[PDB]
Design a binder for this molecule. Structure first.
Ligand SMILES: CC(C)[C@@H](C)NC(=O)[C@H]1N(C(=O)[C@@H](O)[C@H](Cc2ccccc2)NC(=O)[C@@H](NC(=O)[C@@H](N)c2ccccc2)C(C)(C)C)CSC1(C)C
Lengths: 116, 116
């Protein structure tokens, strides 16, 4: 789809995320060209699975604590596309339950920014 | 133009920014569909400029002091357009002097995300 851009309305998509540690869930995610790597809420993973420690710099400062890194690839299905996005690794939000589609996923989408 | 999306390459643009507190200056900004509001460096202003205090939520945390709000509109010229973008207010990065074009600016550009 062509997705308009409006400061008042977050550009969002429904995505089916498979962490390969539990059952795939459909979630609302932010479409974010400023994000190097996709961010999945920890709730989509099983309590036991191993995650990796990581340090993340973003607008609020630097955090050692808030995000982890996955140990398995993550599979993402977007409504219009039959072919699943395959992410070797992404970030995992242990706190604020953020779901954010970054440029790693948008690349495999063939997503572009267009400014006339 | 059409900007392709790549996790290994930040989509950046050259932008002439006018704070209305000195002369127009060129910066390199990140084109960011996850940004509610535009972010410009404090380095554009002289030491003594009236800015407002503000609270900002990012991936690094909530911060009540890294960012200020401008008192006057900001004028922004992009290479591929003649008419300036005029933002009524925007964010000022006092900490890391980041430069981020957000959805406020992208709306005045008729910028879109396109996913095939
Ligand atoms: C998201 C991760 C991959 C992280 C490592 N990367 C980054 O964060 C990169 N950025 C991005 O990826 C941006 O699109 C972020 C996305 C974000 C928004 C709220 C909580 C968490 C993440 N946007 C912001 O930080 C922006 N904050 C907002 O727009 C704020 N109003 C907000 C609060 C809750 C939910 C949506 C929006 C500002 C400060 C730039 C205006 C801006 S700074 C960055 C390093 C270039």
């Amino acid at each position: 789809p062509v997705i308009p851009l409006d400061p008042a309305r977050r550009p969002v998509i429904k995505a089916q995320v498979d962490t390969q540690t539990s059952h795939p869930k459909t979630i609302e995610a932010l479409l974010d060209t400023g994000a190097d790597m996709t961010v999945i809420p920890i709730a989509l993973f099983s309590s036991n699975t191993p995650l990796k420690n990581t340090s993340v710099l973003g607008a609020g400062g630097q955090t050692q604590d808030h995000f982890k890194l996955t140990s398995l690839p993550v599979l993402i299905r977007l409504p219009f596309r039959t072919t699943p996005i395959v992410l070797t690794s992404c970030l995992v939000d242990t706190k604020n339950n953020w779901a954010i589609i970054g440029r790693d996923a948008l690349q495999q989408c063939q997503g572009v920014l267009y400014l006339p």
